[PDB]
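Inputs:
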Amino acid sequence: KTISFNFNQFHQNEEQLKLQRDARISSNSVLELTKVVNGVPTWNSTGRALYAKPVQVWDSTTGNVASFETRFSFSIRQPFPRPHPADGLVFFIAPPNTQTGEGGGYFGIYNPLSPYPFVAVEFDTFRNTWDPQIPHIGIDVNSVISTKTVPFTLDNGGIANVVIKYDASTKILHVVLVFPSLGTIYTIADIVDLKQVLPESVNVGFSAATGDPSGKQRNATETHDILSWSFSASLPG
Amino acid sequence: KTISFNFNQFHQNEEQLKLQRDARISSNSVLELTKVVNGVPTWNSTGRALYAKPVQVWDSTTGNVASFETRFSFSIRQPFPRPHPADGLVFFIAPPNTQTGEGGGYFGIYNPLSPYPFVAVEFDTFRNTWDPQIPHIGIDVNSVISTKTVPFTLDNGGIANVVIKYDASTKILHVVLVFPSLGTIYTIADIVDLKQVLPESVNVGFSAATGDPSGKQRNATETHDILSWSFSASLPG
Ligand SMILES: *[C@@H]1O[C@H](CO)[C@@H](O[C@@H]2O[C@H](CO)[C@@H](O)[C@H](O)[C@H]2NC(C)=O)[C@H](O[C@@H]2O[C@@H](C)[C@@H](O)[C@@H](O)[C@@H]2O)[C@H]1NC(C)=O
Ligand SMILES: *[C@@H]1O[C@H](CO)[C@@H](O[C@@H]2O[C@H](CO)[C@@H](O)[C@H](O)[C@H]2NC(C)=O)[C@H](O[C@@H]2O[C@@H](C)[C@@H](O)[C@@H](O)[C@@H]2O)[C@H]1NC(C)=O
Ligand SMILES: *[C@@H]1O[C@H](CO)[C@@H](O[C@@H]2O[C@H](CO)[C@@H](O)[C@H](O)[C@H]2NC(C)=O)[C@H](O[C@@H]2O[C@@H](C)[C@@H](O)[C@@H](O)[C@@H]2O)[C@H]1NC(C)=O
Ligand SMILES: CO[C@H]1O[C@H](CO)[C@H](O)[C@H](O)[C@H]1NC(C)=O
Ligand SMILES: CO[C@H]1O[C@H](CO)[C@H](O)[C@H](O)[C@H]1NC(C)=O
Ligand SMILES: *[C@@H]1O[C@H](CO)[C@@H](O)[C@H](O)[C@H]1NC(C)=O
Ligand SMILES: [Ca+2]
Ligand SMILES: [Ca+2]
Ligand SMILES: [Mn+2]
Ligand SMILES: [Mn+2]
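Outputs:
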């Protein structure tokens, strides 16, 4: 069992994607997770993009867990340096048919009064009380309080290439972040047992958020665009 | 407390390096692990380059194991496409004061006569009876029969950026290979317990080899140059 897809760009009314909240595909082929009006990103925005079909990460009959690899490119432009940009974007895996969670530092994937499990890779741009210096890459399991974190320097408005790989045999989730214009490379990895946190079928996708109104800073915002996205998974059992 | 070193280029007769066999430093600052005469690489070549001082990867007193990160750039030029270039290069960790092993597919780090333990990251270009398709990245522990491998496409004569990271807490060894001119990214990781395979003090370095005479093919060769190399280790205690 091998499932996979690839998007060299995105088209409006992409029957393969499920857009939620502020998520929208622009006319020039990019997936804009958060609201951007007249070339300017706004605060109080949250949006998600899920692959329409569910993927099987493990099978209870054989006990086998799937291995997978996903690559995507994104760009974050931070027009307003002061006071502070927010909030960042994440690639995540969650149960199917879920609704956008709380915005702000929760990226729209965490919902307090109805928490659902999830594994996520974050690119955090705002420092919340539970965060180390930003920006940083973090591996999140059921919480936005990363199990592992690594700092990185953003290429404002530049393109970022990300590779996320998960090997079921070792349970290692490793992510690579590369900014081709700067030649910088960041790597982070951790052990995660999908079988232990997620159900057999899940949805994979992205989620982002800009500054929350509670911060009372309209400049607390930035863009969260996805330029391309390929995904492949293999379930031997 | 712990070590750190960085070479942005190499100087003829580096007091800091221990060159063995065919390893030499060219007039223009590159470390040529295997023999290259008049711009042409030759077969039957083997060479290593070790950091002169030993590094402590773990302490028996505290039981603490070190974490480390190493980045380097290399270039492999394959002038003769047919019948098959050989053999590749590796970054390795071994006990101090060891001698060059057997060439060919053993890269000069394996010695059947008096085997010594070692952890290595290989960039295999020739397919031996124990190898999967080439080229590939492989993680080797005490043998050249990789515990884990991933295929990659070489940028002939191009520059390759490598990042090798080891986290003692998770025992995860993850390596990243990037070819900036092609924008390609390859990642591989595995669990390795240094404390269980290596002594408290070790040498770190590179080793490469070209076609062995037993193959009866003089074309079985290529260059194995190291352009730069930075290393860092952090042993708490
Ligand atoms: C919110 O973002 C605005 C756009 O970056 C900031 O205004 C810009 O502030 C610059 C000085 O840091 C100034 O040179 C720019 O001309 C100005 N841009 C314009 C025309 O709006 C804004 O900064 C506040 O407003 C400006 C006008 C000054 O009064 C600053 O002292 C203020 O901090 C940002 N506001 C905040 C809360 O950071
Ligand atoms: C492959 O490289 C080897 C390392 O230089 C060559 O070994 C020869 O070893 C001799 C003593 O062991 C030494 O005096 C020689 O300098 C050296 N090679 C020569 C002759 O320059 C090996 O050479 C072959 O094997 C040796 C034992 C001699 O019989 C040579 O005449 C052979 O050419 C190299 N093999 C080949 C096929 O090039
Ligand atoms: C070993 O590498 C040599 C250089 O790449 C090969 O020879 C070159 O082959 C080219 C076409 O394959 C030909 O246009 C070049 O002129 C020639 N260069 C030389 C050495 O004169 C060589 O290939 C064999 O020998 C050549 C001359 C041709 O006859 C080929 O058909 C032969 O396969 C390579 N040897 C092997 C075993 O591949
Ligand atoms: C004061 O914090 C809030 O506003 C910030 C931007 O001003 C950030 O958006 C920050 O994440 C958000 N906090 C939460 C919990 O959503
Ligand atoms: C036929 O195999 C041998 O020759 C090859 C090059 O022709 C390669 O050098 C290959 O690695 C080597 N084998 C060993 C075991 O070293
Ligand atoms: C934030 O957006 C929500 C829904 O998009 C809206 O109901 C709310 O009033 C907005 N907050 C402010 C103060 O703009
Ligand atoms: Ca945050
Ligand atoms: Ca080989
Ligand atoms: Mn964070
Ligand atoms: Mn191999």
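Remarks. Residues 1-237 of chain A form a domain with the Jelly Rolls fold (CATH 2.60.120.200). Chain A touches chain B at residues 71, 161, 163, 165, 167, 170, 172, 174, 176, 178, 180, 183, 185, 187, 189-191 (CB under 8 Å).
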